[PDB]
Design a protein around this ligand. Structure first.
Ligand SMILES: O=c1ccn([C@H]2C[C@H](O)[C@@H](COP(=O)(O)NP(=O)(O)OP(=O)(O)O)O2)c(=O)[nH]1
Ligand SMILES: O=c1ccn([C@H]2C[C@H](O)[C@@H](COP(=O)(O)NP(=O)(O)OP(=O)(O)O)O2)c(=O)[nH]1
Ligand SMILES: O=c1ccn([C@H]2C[C@H](O)[C@@H](COP(=O)(O)NP(=O)(O)OP(=O)(O)O)O2)c(=O)[nH]1
Ligand SMILES: [Mg+2]
Ligand SMILES: [Mg+2]
Ligand SMILES: [Mg+2]
Lengths: 113, 113, 113
């Protein structure tokens, strides 16, 4: 069980923190959305929230990551919502399949609940 | 006809403002993208713009929300662009089906028009 | 070969910088994800990164743009990852098919590599 601080960037100017799948998983289009486990857990740095996005090279290989919001105070496991687009997709354990982007969390006076 | 300030957050640390559908709508994959009405209207707080994203629990139930940009000065109704992925999806009136995230709008010297 | 500074906004309050396709391209659902060329190149302004998103009017016409991350220091050509959802889609040369959003790039102590 690892915190976000254990993630790595591909390059200093890379916006994304790479996320791997902890299981070998096979996906087909008729399966629809599947939640892949990452072994990485929230919460995020103060005043930030997260967006999970696909890696372009993975998207182009037929695995669609659906954009997901990670709330600042989420303490569960970060999962990747993914679907094979057209073809059979095989995700091996340790393949980097998504990236976490950190964004400023803006305060508003919207009521909470 | 309601402003964004009428939206609520699920929790203090929730990044998203929840959006409901004001109509009962049935969606099938062969329908392609449909724009669902929310009864909520722009514009946004100064120096901000919006992103519409799916709720994870809704995505996992087979309703794909396509990420949408809400411009700072948009004064129309916020619509959710959505598609049933694999199966028949029934949206009831009042179901929260998307979330609005607020982001900083960066100024640049790009020409306007 | 053009820099991001050559892009235009539709309106002063438009969050997105519009991206065109430099080729006439036909897309069908069975083709899966295709990378469309824009003739626009990174890198981005300092302390920023990019997100490529669909235009709503294009999404509603059946062309799905998959959200893409443009890293701050990317110096290659910005491509649009796109898929025809349900129907045959014809992209003409010069049609604006996506938009680039600029976001703050947050520094963290995550290891780089
Ligand atoms: O891709 C994702 C999306 C969300 N999550 C987690 C983190 C996020 O804080 C949490 C809640 O997600 P959303 O608000 O998008 N989901 P939903 O509105 O269905 O649940 P809730 O009512 O708890 O907010 O689910 C992931 O692990 N992966
Ligand atoms: O999911 C969305 C996306 C956009 N919208 C509205 C708000 C946004 O400001 C407006 C314009 O959207 P985009 O720029 O993405 N659309 P497009 O480029 O086709 O139209 P325009 O030329 O007016 O900018 O449409 C929604 O209500 N829901
Ligand atoms: O839609 C996109 C997405 C990315 N790109 C370019 C810019 C981005 O900096 C670069 C790398 O994209 P990602 O990190 O999402 N891709 P991936 O992780 O597969 O490659 P890398 O290992 O180089 O980071 O590809 C586009 O031109 N269009
Ligand atoms: Mg990458
Ligand atoms: Mg939520
Ligand atoms: Mg536009």
């Amino acid at each position: 069980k690892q915190p976000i601080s254990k993630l790595t960037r591909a390059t200093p100017g890379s916006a994304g923190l790479d996320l791997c799948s902890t299981s070998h998983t096979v996906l087909t289009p008729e399966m629809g959305p599947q939640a892949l486990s990452t072994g990485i857990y929230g919460p995020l740095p103060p005043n930030t929230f997260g967006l999970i996005l696909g890696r372009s090279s993975i998207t182009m290989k037929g695995l669609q990551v659906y954009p997901g919001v990670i709330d600042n105070d989420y303490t569960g496991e970060i999962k990747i919502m993914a679907k094979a687009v057209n073809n059979i997709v095989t995700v091996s354990q340790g393949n980097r399949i998504a990236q976490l982007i950190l964004l400023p969390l803006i305060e508003t006076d919207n009521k909470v609940q």
